[PDB]
Amino acid sequence: DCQVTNPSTGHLFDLSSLSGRAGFTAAYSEKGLVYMSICGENENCPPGVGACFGQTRISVGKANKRLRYVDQVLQLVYKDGSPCPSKSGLSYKSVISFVCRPENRPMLISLDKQTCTLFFSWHTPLACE
């Protein structure tokens, strides 16, 4: 269960092929990484957590299957992560954006320290048309 349709074309986008507890990794810092699963928890993270830092297993967002379609982009937003070290009261959240790739792994493109939001991009043919 990982899909969404284009509101004006009826086209159905299905990312179920990327789902699974095994998940993937995104390069974080020098040699560190972030473990993440699509539309579900990751086996390398705490129960119910969809993305986490590899060194600590600390959560950067609880998994969910709420895939949204926004201006040709497919997006997932994992919220309710662990406490933000850069701002009191906030929790980590992860934004995963799928963009069409005419023709491998997600990329952490930005870490907003003021809102503790990790922005990832994933160019895949699964998001085309």
Swiss-Prot record:
Superkingdom classification of source: Eukaryota
Localization, UniProt: Golgi apparatus membrane; Endosome membrane
Disulphide bonds in the chain: 2-39, 45-52, 84-116, 100-128
Domain MRH: residue ranges: 1-129
Post-translational modification: Palmitoylated. Undergoes cysteine S-palmitoylation which promotes interaction with the retromer cargo-selective complex which mediates its retrograde trafficking to the Golgi apparatus.
Role: Mediates the transport of phosphorylated lysosomal enzymes from the Golgi complex and the cell surface to lysosomes. Lysosomal enzymes bearing phosphomannosyl residues bind specifically to mannose-6-phosphate receptors in the Golgi apparatus and the resulting receptor-ligand complex is transported to an acidic prelysosomal compartment where the low pH mediates the dissociation of the complex. The receptor is then recycled back to the Golgi for another round of trafficking through its binding to the retromer. This receptor also binds IGF2.
UniProt record similarity statement: Belongs to the MRL1/IGF2R family.
Subunit structure: Binds HA-I and HA-II plasma membrane adapters. Interacts with DPP4; the interaction is direct. Binds GGA1, GGA2 and GGA3. Interacts with the heterotrimeric retromer cargo-selective complex (CSC), formed by VPS26 (VPS26A or VPS26B), VPS29 and VPS35; which is involved in retrograde trafficking of the receptor from endosomes to the Golgi apparatus.
Record comment regarding domains: Contains 15 repeating units of approximately 147 AA harboring four disulfide bonds each. The most highly conserved region within the repeat consists of a stretch of 13 AA that contains cysteines at both ends.
Protein name per its UniProtKB record: Cation-independent mannose-6-phosphate receptor
